[PDB]
């Protein structure tokens, strides 16, 4: 389902922004 | 379910972006 | 509810990105 | 309700990111 | 509808972030 | 419909943000 | 949008069930 | 918006069905 | 997608229930 | 939230229809 | 996903009510 | 969450309505 795909993408986005914010 | 996971990730995204903005 | 939390988080994200864009 | 608020915030986010991309 | 507006905004967001990444 | 478009756009956003975080 | 159409149908469904219950 | 209207209509539907079931 | 299918089914249900109520 | 209200009403509707069917 | 399940159930509900209305 | 509860309730409603139709 789409909501499952959206949740997965947002987990990746959150991780990327965690790396950016710490850098 | 998925909606709660979405909400959780967006809360984390908001904290990271507030840190970046500061 | 989840939709209210999502809306609140996006309001915060918009606020932060406005600050970032403004120099 | 929340869905309309989500739409409004994402519109603001889109404008801020266009500003950042242009700046 | 709101979902249509959300989808359109996310297309703009994707386009801007592609430009930023490049 | 719209939810699938949203998922597709978020996959693209996730890719661009991973690229940004990696430099 | 679909959500608007769904709300319209549920208003019709609600009225039909009112007629059944009160009939 | 639409989700709140859907909820209101479903509350009415539940009330009518409670009358029928009762 | 699924939301459009839901709207289509609810329009059908509304018509069927109106016929039942008129009977 | 709207979804919580919708879920609550649908639980009521399902119970009423169980009573009707039984 | 849940939305796919909801659509499937409403397809079944529509068929059941159509059969009742036609009878 | 709520969407899964909505799905479960509609599955129950569908079984009950099929029983009534039968």
Cα–Cα dist F14/A11, whole Å: 9
- Whether chain J lies against chain H with 3 or more Cβ pairs closer than 8 A is yes
CA distances from B10 to A1, A8, B14, C2, F11 (A): 19, 12, 6, 11, 15
B4 interaction partners in chain C (CB closer than 8 Å) = 2
Q: How many Cα neighbours within 13 Å face the side chain of B8?
A: 10
Cα–Cα dist I13/I15, whole Å: 5
CA distances from B17 to B5, B22, H21, L20 (A): 18, 8, 53, 55
F1 interaction partners in chain I (CB closer than 8 Å) = 1, 3-4
Q: What one-character DSSP code corresponds to residue F22?
A: T
Q: Yes or no: say if G4 and H2 are a contact pair by the CB < 8 Å rule.
A: yes
A16 close contact with B: CB closer than 8 A: no
Q: Please state, as a whole number, how many other Cβ atoms lie within 10 Å of the Cβ of residue I23.
A: 10
Using DSSP, state whether J1 is helix, strand or coil: coil
Handedness of CA A12, A17, A18, A19 (dihedral sign): positive
To 5 degrees, how large is the angle CA I18–CA J1–CA J6? 25
Cα–Cα dist B16/C16, whole Å: 10
I7 to G19: CB separation less than 8 angstroms, yes or no: no
Tokens of A6: 């959206």
- Given the structure tokens 């009939």, which residue do they identify? G23
**Exposed / middle / buried, residue C23 (Cβ in 10 Å: 0-12, 13-18, 19+):** exposed
Residue spans of beta strands (DSSP E) within G1-23? none
Contacts of K11 (CB under 8 A, 6+ apart): I5, I9
Tokens of B3: 């909606």
Cα–Cα dist A23/B8, whole Å: 22
Helices (H), chain A: 2-22
Q: What one-character DSSP code corresponds to residue C23?
A: -
D2 interaction partners in chain J (CB closer than 8 Å) = 1-2
Cα–Cα dist G6/G2, whole Å: 6
Q: Please state, as a whole number, how many other Cβ atoms lie within 10 Å of the Cβ of residue C16.
A: 22
């Amino acid at each position: 389902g789409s909501l499952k795909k959206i949740a997965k993408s947002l987990k990746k986005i959150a991780y990327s922004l965690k790396k950016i914010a710490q850098g | 379910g998925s909606l709660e996971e979405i909400a959780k990730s967006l809360e984390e995204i908001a904290w990271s972006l507030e840190e970046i903005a500061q």
